[PDB]
Structure 1
C-alpha cells in the first residue's frame, strides 16, 4: 500500500510526506509502534493525520503506512457482557498483557477468535439471499443471535455448513461467485446502516422514574437531551435508566467522564437482576469507556462506535437504548482538532460544522422496519454539560433543534436535595399526544385527565409562589393556602424519588396512577370540607397526610392492599371532620 515518512509532529497531529495516493478518512499506522491514525486533509504530496493515541517520543522520519480502509468495527457474536475502549479493543484483554496502566501500541482482536459457538443453519443450497437476511442462529446469554448477510452483499447460496460448533472466523455460507460469509462482518462507523422504512413511534419508553414517565414521556424511537450544571444528577439518572428500563439491549457510552463510574458499573451490574428475563443485568449491557485522561482524539470515535453497535443490534429485531454520558467532551475534541488544523472558529471556539455532526448523530435513532422484515427501534439519551449552567452556549442550542424531549435540570433543586431535580417548568416533551391511545388501553381510561389535573395544580402553585414570598403566606385565602399545601404534597410525595432506596428506586405505572388518585381525592375532599367552615391548619393536622407521605416506600406487591385502605381512610377522616 501507500507508504510514507513523518514530516512534522505537533500535539495529536502528524503530517506525513510521500503519501500521494492515500484517500480521505482512511486509517493509517503511524510510527514504528503502529499508532492508529486517520487522514483528514490532503495537500499535494503530504497528508494530515490525527492520532488516536499519545504521540510523545515520536521522531521525524519514522514510517507511515496506510491501510486503505476507513474506521470500521467488527459486528458479530461476543459483544455482549464486554467493555471496550474508544476504538473497540477489549480492556480486560489489554490488562492481561500490559498491567494496571494503559499503554499505546497494543493490538487486540475485538471478537474472541477461540470460542466455540453452536451453529444452526437456516438456509439451503439453491436459495437466493440479499442484504439483511438471516443465515442462521447462534445461542447467547438468553438471547438468540442471528447471523445477518452484510447489507452490500447479494448472490445465490452454493453450500451451507452443517450444524456444529465453530469459531467466528470459519466460513459458514459460500456464495456462487466465490464470496465467503462468516459469522462476523465489518462496517464503517461513519455510514448509517440502511433500513426499509421508518415508522412513527407509538409506544412509551418506560424509564422507571415517575416524573419522566408521567409528565414528560419519551417514545420507543425518540430522542431526549438532559442538560444541567455539575452535581445535578445527569449520571445517576442515566445509570437508573440503564438499570430499570424495559429495553432489550443497553449500550453505554462514557465519552470523556470519570473512571470510577465505569468501575461502579463493572462491579454492581454482575450482581443485579435483569427486569425482563431474570438473568444478570450485565448480560444485556455493552460498555464503551473513554475516560477523561485517555487520549482526546478517541472521544470522537467512541460515539460512532456506540451508535454503530446500537444500529447493529437494531437489525436483529431488538429494542435498543443508547446513553451518551457527555457530548460536550466530543465537542471539545472537535474544537481541539480544529485548533490544530488552524481553521477559523465560528462561535466560542467551536468549529462551524458542529451542528451538522450533532444532527447526524441524533438522526440515527427511530423505529424502523429492518431489511430482514423485522421491527426494531433505537432511543438516544444524550447528556449536555454547559459551562457554568449557561443554557445559551452553542452545544445546547444545536441539540434543542433536533431532540423531541428536553429534560432540564436545576441547581437550586440539587442544593436542597430534591432529586431527580427536574425543572418541571422549563422541561417539555413532544411525544405526549401520540402515546395517549396506549395509556387509555394499558393503565386506565382516565389517566390523561388525571395528568392534566396535576399539571394544572402545579401551574396554579407556581402562580401563587410569586405572591406568597413578598406579600406573606397569611394574606392568602383558605383556598389558596390549600392549593399551596397540595402543591407541596405533590412536590414532596410524588415528584421526588430516591435512586438509592431499596424500594423507591423503581416505580411502576399503576403505582404512580394510584398515587395521583390519592392526591386528587384528598384535594377534592379538602376543597369540599373548606366550604363547611373548617380551618386550614386543622386539615394539615389530619393523620391521613402521613399515609400519602409513606405511600411511595410501599413495595409493588403490597401497594394494592395499601391503596384500598387509603381510599377508605381519606373519605372516613374527612367525613368525621366537623
Structure 2
C-alpha cells in the first residue's frame, strides 16, 4: 500500500518486543503456514500482525526530558524474556532533544513512550517499536575489521577455522540433516547473545520437525529455553518462492536490529537442494544473482553502532550450502565460496568413520586466522598461532605420509615417520574429535583448548627427541601418559589437564634414563 519508485512497495519489518520467541514466515507474519506471490514488486495476503498490540511490556526509561539524542540512542529498556533485555532506540534518521518521555510502567507497543523535538523543530513520536525496509542495510558509524573471534567452543573450528564476530562462514548440506550436529552446536554455543535462524525447507508430510521440538529446546548457557534468545524464520516448501527469497533480508534486518543495541548476533541461513530458475530466460539478458548474494553477505559485520555512546555490535553470518546434485561444482557453491571468508568442509567420509565434528581439516579454510590471532595472544595464549600452525603442519605431513603409504605400505617406514603418525593420530583423536553429547566435552573454553594443545605439542616435541635419542617408538606408544592425554577432553579442571605436561616430561625422562647416553 504505497507508490512505485524502484524496488516494490514499502517492504518492511517491525522491530521491537516479541521478535524473540516469535516464529515468522519470510515477511514477518506470525506462524500459521501461508503465501506471498511476486517479482521485484509487492504482495497480497492475510490479517496477522507481527509484534502483538495487546501485550503490555514493562518499560524502564533511560533518559530524561532535556537530553540530546541521536539516531540509535537508547531511551529505555524492556525485559522481554528472562535472557534478553530489549533496548528501545531512537530510530535512525531522528535527532533532537527529549521533550517527553514515558515513566517506569507497563505499555502496549502502540503507545508513545517519547517525543523528540528535532533541530528545525518538528516533533517526533517514538514507539517501543520501529519499522525498517528489509532491503536497505541498516546504517551504522563504522565497520570494524575482523578481530574478535566468535568463540564456538568446538575445537577444530576455534583453532583451525575460526569465525570472526561479524564474519561470514558457509557449511554444507541442510541444517536439518541428521548426519552431523555442529550446526546445532554452533547455534547453541557461539557467544552471540541472539540467534536468528532462517530454517529453510522441510521433509515428509507429518508436519512437526523444527516447529515442535524447539520451544522445548534448552539453552545450555542459562538453563532457560533457547527460544528466549532466538528468532525463527520458517521457509516451508508449501510456501511461495518470493517469501523464501525475502526471508533472508528479513532475518538479516532483524539481526542488524539486535547488533544496533550492542549485541552479538549469529544468523544461520539454512538451504536445500532446490533449482532456482535462472536458466529460464533467453533474450533480454544472469550472474547478477551472484552479486545479490554477495551484497547479502556483506551486510555482515562488527560495527560501531549509531548512538552518542561508543557501542559495538555484530552480525556474523553462517550459511548452509546445498548444491542441487550434492555436486559441489554447482554454481551455488562457487558463488558462495567466492564471498564467504570461512568454509567448514563437512565431510561424509569423516561421518562414516564416526570422526566427529565431521569437519575436513584439509579442505576447510578460514581467512580470519591472522585477524583473530591477536585476540588469542593477548587474552588466552601467546603461543596460540604458533601452536595452530605447528599442529596444522603435522596434519598436513600426515596427509602426505598417508598418500605414500596407500601405495607402498607401512612396513618400510622409519621410526621417525611412525612417530609422526602416532602423534598426528593423537592430534586427530584427542583434539580434533569432540564429543558433542558429553556434558563436559560438548563445550571447550579457549583456556582449555590451548592447554590441551600444549599437552599434545609437548608430547610431540618429546616424542621426536626420544626417537632421536634412540628410544623405541613402541615404548613411546605405551607411555602411560597417553591414556590420560586421550581422556583430557573430559576433564573440567584445566589445571589438572595442564599437569599432564609435567607428567609427560617425567615419563619421558624415565625413558631417557632406561636408554643410557
Tell me the CA shift for residue 163 of structure 1: 3.2
Q: Does 1:561 align with 2:493?
A: no
Which structure has more relative contact order (CA 8 Å, sep 6+)? It is 2
Which has the higher Rg, Structure 1 or Structure 2? 1
Aligned residue pairs total 493
1:19-168 equivalence runs, <5 A: 25-26=7-8, 69-91=9-31, 94=32, 106-125=46-65, 129-141=69-81, 142-168=83-109
1:216 corresponds to = 161
- Does the CA-based 8 Å contact 2:216-2:225 persist in structure 1? no
1:550 and 1:84 mapped to 2: Cα distance?
A: 43
TM-score (norm: length of structure 1)? 0.78
- Does the CA-based 8 Å contact 2:161-2:366 persist in structure 1? yes
SS at match of 2:302: strand
1:349-498 equivalence runs, <5 A: 351-372=286-307, 373=309, 374-498=311-435
Tell me the CA shift for residue 232 of structure 1: 7.7
- Does the CA-based 8 Å contact 1:233-1:419 persist in structure 2? no
Q: Does 1:510 align with 2:447?
A: yes
Q: Deviations over 1:488-539 (max 9, x none)?
A: 2211221112222332211112222222222222222222222344433343
- Does the CA-based 8 Å contact 1:525-1:571 persist in structure 2? no
SS at match of 1:292: coil
- Does the CA-based 8 Å contact 1:405-1:429 persist in structure 2? yes
2:210 corresponds to = 262
2:244 corresponds to = 299
TM-score (norm: length of structure 2)? 0.87
Q: Deviations over 1:72-119 (max 9, x none)?
A: 11111121122222221222xx49xxxxxxxx9642111121121222
- Does the CA-based 8 Å contact 2:376-2:384 persist in structure 1? yes
SS at match of 2:287: coil
1:275-294 equivalence runs, <5 A: 275=221, 279-294=224-239
Gap change, CA 1:24 and 1:328, over 3 Å in 2: farther
Gap change, CA 1:502 and 1:160, over 3 Å in 2: closer
Tell me the CA shift for residue 167 of structure 1: 0.8
Gap change, CA 1:135 and 1:510, over 3 Å in 2: closer
Tell me the CA shift for residue 566 of structure 1: 6.0
Gap change, CA 1:318 and 1:152, over 3 Å in 2: same
1:23 and 1:234 mapped to 2: Cα distance?
A: 47
Q: Deviations over 1:405-448 (max 9, x none)?
A: 22222222122121212221222211111222221221222222
2:270 corresponds to = 325
2:318 and 2:428 mapped to 1: Cα distance?
A: 25
1:262 and 1:229 mapped to 2: Cα distance?
A: 13
Q: Deviations over 1:285-307 (max 9, x none)?
A: 11112223433332112111110
Tell me the CA shift for residue 179 of structure 1: 3.8
1:285 and 1:567 mapped to 2: Cα distance?
A: 44
1:187 corresponds to = 132
Q: Does 1:547 align with 2:488?
A: no
1:284 and 1:76 mapped to 2: Cα distance?
A: 14
1:247 corresponds to = 192
- Does the CA-based 8 Å contact 1:257-1:326 persist in structure 2? no
SS at match of 2:187: helix
2:133 and 2:326 mapped to 1: Cα distance?
A: 36
Q: Does 1:315 align with 2:270?
A: no
- Does the CA-based 8 Å contact 2:180-2:358 persist in structure 1? no
Q: Does 1:197 align with 2:145?
A: no
1:232 and 1:541 mapped to 2: Cα distance?
A: 39
Q: Deviations over 1:175-194 (max 9, x none)?
A: 55354221112111111111
Tell me the CA shift for residue 451 of structure 1: 1.6
2:262 and 2:158 mapped to 1: Cα distance?
A: 24
Tell me the CA shift for residue 466 of structure 1: 1.6
Over the aligned positions, Cα root-mean-square deviation in angstroms equals 2.9
Gap change, CA 1:364 and 1:265, over 3 Å in 2: farther
Tell me the CA shift for residue 328 of structure 1: 6.2
Unaligned runs of 5+ in 1: 3-20, 27-68, 96-103
Structure 1 segments, 4+ long, off by >6 Å, are 229-235
- Does the CA-based 8 Å contact 2:174-2:271 persist in structure 1? no
